[PDB]
Design a protein around this ligand. Structure first.
Ligand SMILES: Nc1nc2c(ncn2[C@@H]2O[C@H](COP(=O)(O)OP(=O)(O)O)[C@@H](O)[C@H]2O)c(=O)[nH]1
Ligand SMILES: C[C@H](NC(=O)CNC(=O)c1cccc(Cl)c1)c1ccccc1
Ligand SMILES: [Mg+2]
Lengths: 57, 338, 126, 234, 279
């Protein structure tokens, strides 16, 4: 009974996972690149920070 | 009947694999070879935070990027002040053993956990001026792993009984149970939409949960050993994992596929904590080899190593505004790196 | 994904020989240390024999010393366990266990609860 | 700028207060020596710690020779402990209470000890061995019905160690089997471990009035070796 | 024969770079604040820096080669006080490390109860303070030989106090603590698999104490014989012996490094890693 219930839960979860709209991955990578390059200026780590606005020195 | 169930489960699994193969087409590395490398990012220590007594397991940055809280095996819930290197408060825990820390974005509450199966809740702004136990959330059996504040009144918290409980401090009752993992879940992170989170268990799998309906929307797989590091990308459509097999993956929620592996042969010990930066070219991850490094999330290249640590690194947190990153290792030290 | 499928095993009277194979996938076979776990009916879980990365660190449980033989094929991602001269008591179920952590010599897989990285097992009856 | 001035002054005042409190907590944290209990499911952990209390986690505090120890009886968890056992790395020693009569789980006990010694973060801490249930072992060896030679065929091809020190009221058979168990653990103990951490077996029973002294001796030796290695005296 | 010329430059080139390297390595240790003996080693290295630099360079190059024409009122008797402060500082930093080793070896369970970094700073600054305080009475230190000496009443008491504070107490307490450590580690039964354990620690302790005693005996004996007796005052036997004995004190100050810091293999591995760190 326990094994049957576990198998039923597993198959229903996997079938719920199957019924998911998939997305072609290269445009996801393009979105990642666009977001990353759009926030490169604001990142204090990528662009070294001047000592005046840097509060850690 | 069991044989038929196994056969149809395998059929569904290979159907999912075929769908993943059909939706692969091209790899990220081939199309991202034209991006300029970050290069070496030479980073020193700014101010060292030495106030802890034993190993440090968890830390969480506050929303203001001013004050943050950290864990220690002594039973302390010290809250630090970043710019001025000051102790704003000190919360003595009843249970010496702690494994998780969260800072409520409202700035008035701090959480903790540990082996006692109690995810104790503490308040900060009080009339008497002394901290105290707000509510002793109880109901788990396994050891408590990670906690974060969904809002000012609810917390989602991961334990060692393979069950994740979402709570309500006002009522002290488990609102929802997320029972879909086989092994013990280690770490879950908060997406900016504050409605989704990913839970990674010791079965080398990450399963995505939705806060409202409380069901496993999807799962992610591809690691070889137990995973104990997680963080959402700021956009909310990516998350990187650090396992014990010295590999960091990057699964995308929308496509449900592994992207790339962050690894190199000379690394033989696994990642413990990860923290995405504010943009994306910076990916930080601790290591057992007495040091912490930063990976380039778009080019599979290491960029600098935050050396200077003894024992093991177990926690990692970048400020919300990206001013700096604090890494705490087992030497009871917190260091601020720009 | 990490899968461990066991092969072989049938109803054999005391004596004779059996061939048991483990089908491994989703992980690197060479570095990980691997062992087998037994399950006596009405009893708990235990360990059979382990082979390290080199293959020269063979050790045996007290129950079987000259009776059993463990071997592996790293190229084909297969781990082998040679049976001969069986006994009625060895009527267990053989799970293809593996220690999780790469490049080490420690693992706690004698757990009764369902550990992640071991298979569904094959029944062997004497 | 006055507001920033007084805010900084307030934070500095809070720092001096918190540092005073944390130094006060420093004085006691290192004073308490952490200990950890591990073993078989029915291995005698809770009842031994309860017995010595008179002198989730079932913690305990006790005072012996003006120095305080902390014993941990972790039982509110699952049977999987691959992961939370790492939290006990900065712990003085591990107590290993093992069943001595029921030989069926002795192989699991061997495996458990072998896993503890060779773990890649427990190699620094020493292990203390308790062979509990000695009265049961003595009683059931005298009966002889269990046939200890079945579970270990090499048990017979063995003799008492020359350095055996039996209690005068004991029996050659029970002592010979019992030192067999000790030596068969220690062959695992010696096979790995390059002088960093040492195993010390102590023959102890559940209700004993001198159990604390053995813990004191073992922890003293472990800290002595660690501290001498910490200097150059090695 | 230019024996000081050929020896002291070698002593500088052997000690000063090594001790500077050790100071820069040991200051930057992250675990340095965790446990007490490493802060003590930093104190001893700094004391070595002061004694080596000040005495060897300043005194035993300037006033022996291109100086001693300086006015002696303020300078000579301030720099001499500084040199004596350096000697006493070296000895009195070597000592509390010995008491720490004794407490840490004989009472392992109470070690962190009795010793912790907070008391380390107090006891490490107190020795510097008391040395600088007790060095200012050495302003009226006797000028050896010269045109005249005169056994002034302050000279003999100064000599006796210096002897007691540099050898008589430190050597005796080194002896006592090392002997007790050896006694309890030899009479008490150790582990069976520790055959090459008691021999090594016994050998290192006895060699440390014996080398210190033997290298600091000659100066004390010579100065005491100068205070007492009726010296023949021959240029050879009283001055060459004095200079070779005073050379032995600087030999001991230089070799205390190889005695303490060099033996530990852990120090060696960071030294090996950091030798190529610059390149
Ligand atoms: N008669 C007897 N009983 C013992 C001995 N050692 C342990 N026990 C039993 O074991 C119990 C104490 O061990 P316990 O802490 O409860 O083991 P655990 O709860 O399974 O972890 C007692 O109830 C005793 O009955 C022994 O030496 N003699
Ligand atoms: C600077 C000082 N140098 C000295 O103290 C020189 N004094 C003597 O040699 C002397 C000899 C006999 C009797 C008397 Cl009273 C004095 C010194 C310091 C360290 C090592 C060596 C020397
Ligand atoms: Mg119990």
């Amino acid at each position: 009974t326990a094994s049957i219930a576990q198998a039923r839960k597993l198959v229903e979860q996997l079938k719920m996972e199957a019924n998911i709209d998939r997305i072609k991955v290269s445009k996801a990578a393009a979105d990642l690149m666009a977001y990353c390059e759009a926030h490169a200026k604001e990142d204090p780590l990528l662009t070294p920070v001047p000592a005046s606005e840097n509060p850690f020195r | 009947e069991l044989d038929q169930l196994r056969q149809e489960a395998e059929q569904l699994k290979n159907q999912i694999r075929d769908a993943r193969k059909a939706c692969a087409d091209a790899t990220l590395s081939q199309i991202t070879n034209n991006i300029d490398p970050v290069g070496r990012i030479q980073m020193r220590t700014r101010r060292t935070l030495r106030g802890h007594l034993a190993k440090i397991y968890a830390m969480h940055w506050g929303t203001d990027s001013r004050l943050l809280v950290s864990a220690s095996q002594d039973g302390k819930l010290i809250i630090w002040d970043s710019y001025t290197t000051n102790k704003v408060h000190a919360i003595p825990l009843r249970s010496s053993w702690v494994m998780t820390c969260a800072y409520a974005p409202s700035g008035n509450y701090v959480a903790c956990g540990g082996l006692d199966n109690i995810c104790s809740i503490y308040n900060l702004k009080t009339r008497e001026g002394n901290v105290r136990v707000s509510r002793e959330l109880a109901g788990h059996t396994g050891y408590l792993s990670c906690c974060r504040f969904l809002d000012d009144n609810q917390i989602v918290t991961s334990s060692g009984d393979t069950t994740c409980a979402l709570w309500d401090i006002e009522t002290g009752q488990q609102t929802t149970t997320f029972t879909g993992h086989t092994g013990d879940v280690m770490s879950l992170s908060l997406a900016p939409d504050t409605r989704l989170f990913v839970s990674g268990a010791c079965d080398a799998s990450a399963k995505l949960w939705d806060v409202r309906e409380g069901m496993c929307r999807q799962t992610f797989t591809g690691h070889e050993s137990d995973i104990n590091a997680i963080c959402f990308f700021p956009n909310g459509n990516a998350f990187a994992t650090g396992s014990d097999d010295a590999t960091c993956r990057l699964f995308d929620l929308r496509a449900d596929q592994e992207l790339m592996t962050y690894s190199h042969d000379n690394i033989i010990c696994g990642i413990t904590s990860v923290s995405f930066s504010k943009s994306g070219r910076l990916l930080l991850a601790g290591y057992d080899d007495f040091n912490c490094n930063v990976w380039d999330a778009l080019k599979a290249d290491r960029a600098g190593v935050l050396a200077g640590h003894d024992n093991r690194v177990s926690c990692l947190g970048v400020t919300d505004d990206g001013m700096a990153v604090a890494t705490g290792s087992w030497d009871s030290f917190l260091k601020i790196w720009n | 994904q990490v899968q461990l499928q066991e092969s072989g095993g049938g109803l054999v009277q005391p004596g004779g020989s059996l061939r048991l194979s483990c089908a491994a996938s989703g992980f690197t076979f060479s570095n990980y240390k691997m062992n087998w776990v037994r399950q006596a009916p009405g009893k708990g879980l235990e360990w059979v024999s382990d082979i390290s990365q080199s293959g020269a660190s063979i050790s045996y449980t007290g129950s079987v010393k000259g009776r059993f033989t463990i071997s592996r094929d790293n190229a084909k991602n297969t781990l082998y366990l040679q049976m001969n001269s069986l006994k009625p008591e060895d009527t267990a179920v053989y799970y293809c266990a593996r220690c999780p952590a790469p490049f080490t010599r420690d693992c706690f897989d004698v757990t009764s609860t369902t550990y992640a990285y071991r298979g569904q097992g094959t029944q062997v009856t004497v | 700028t006055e507001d920033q001035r007084n805010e900084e002054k307030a934070q500095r005042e809070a720092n001096k207060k918190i540092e005073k409190q944390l130094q006060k907590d420093k004085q006691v944290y290192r004073a308490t020596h952490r200990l950890l209990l591990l073993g078989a499911d029915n291995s005698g952990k809770s009842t031994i710690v309860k017995q010595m209390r008179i002198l989730g986690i079932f913690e305990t505090k006790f005072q012996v020779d003006k120095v305080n120890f902390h014993m941990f009886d972790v039982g509110g968890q699952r049977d999987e402990r691959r992961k939370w056992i790492q939290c006990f790395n900065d712990v003085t020693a591990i107590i290993f209470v093992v069943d001595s009569s029921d030989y069926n789980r002795l192989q699991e006990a061997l495996n458990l000890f072998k896993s503890i010694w060779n773990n890649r973060w427990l190699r620094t801490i020493s292990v203390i061995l308790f062979l509990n249930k000695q009265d049961l072992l003595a009683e059931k060896v005298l009966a002889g019905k269990s046939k200890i030679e079945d579970y270990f065929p090499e048990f017979a091809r063995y003799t008492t160690p020359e350095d055996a020190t039996p209690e005068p009221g004991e029996d050659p058979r029970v002592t010979r089997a019992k030192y067999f168990i000790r030596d068969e653990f220690l062959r695992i103990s010696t096979a790995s471990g390059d002088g960093r951490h040492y195993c010390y077996p102590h023959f102890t029973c559940a209700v004993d009035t001198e159990n604390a002294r053995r813990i004191f001796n073992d922890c003293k030796d472990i800290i002595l070796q660690m501290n001498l290695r910490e200097y150059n005296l090695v | 024969g230019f024996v000081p010329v050929v020896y002291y430059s070698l002593l500088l080139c052997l000690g000063l770079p090594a001790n500077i390297l050790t100071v820069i390595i040991l200051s930057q240790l992250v675990a340095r604040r965790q446990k007490s003996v490493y802060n003590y080693l930093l104190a001893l290295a700094a004391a070595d820096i002061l004694v080596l630099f000040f005495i060897v360079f300043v005194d035993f190059l300037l006033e022996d080669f291109i100086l001693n024409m300086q006015m002696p009122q303020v300078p000579d008797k301030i720099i001499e006080v500084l040199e004596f402060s350096s000697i006493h500082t070296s000895i009195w930093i070597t000592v509390p490390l010995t008491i720490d080793r004794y407490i840490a070896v004989c009472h392992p369970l109470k070690y962190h109860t009795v010793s912790y970094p907070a008391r380390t700073r107090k006891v490490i600054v107190s020795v510097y303070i008391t040395c600088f305080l007790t060095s200012i009475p050495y302003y009226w230190w006797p000028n050896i030989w010269t045109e005249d000496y005169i056994s002034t009443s302050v000279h003999h008491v100064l000599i006796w106090i210096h002897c007691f504070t540099v050898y008589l107490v430190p050597c005796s307490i080194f002896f006592i603590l090392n002997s007790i450590i050896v006694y309890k580690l030899r009479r008490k039964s150790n582990f069976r698999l520790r055959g090459y354990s008691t021999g090594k620690t016994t050998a290192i302790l006895f060699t440390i104490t014996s080398i210190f005693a033997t290298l600091w005996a000659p100066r004390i004996i010579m100065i005491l014989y100068h205070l007492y007796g009726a010296p023949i005052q021959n240029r050879w036997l009283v001055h060459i012996m004095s200079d070779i004995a005073n050379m032995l004190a600087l030999l001991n100050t230089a070799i205390n490094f190889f005695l303490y810091c060099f033996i530990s293999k852990r120090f060696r591995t960071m030294a090996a890693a950091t030798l190529k760190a610059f390149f």
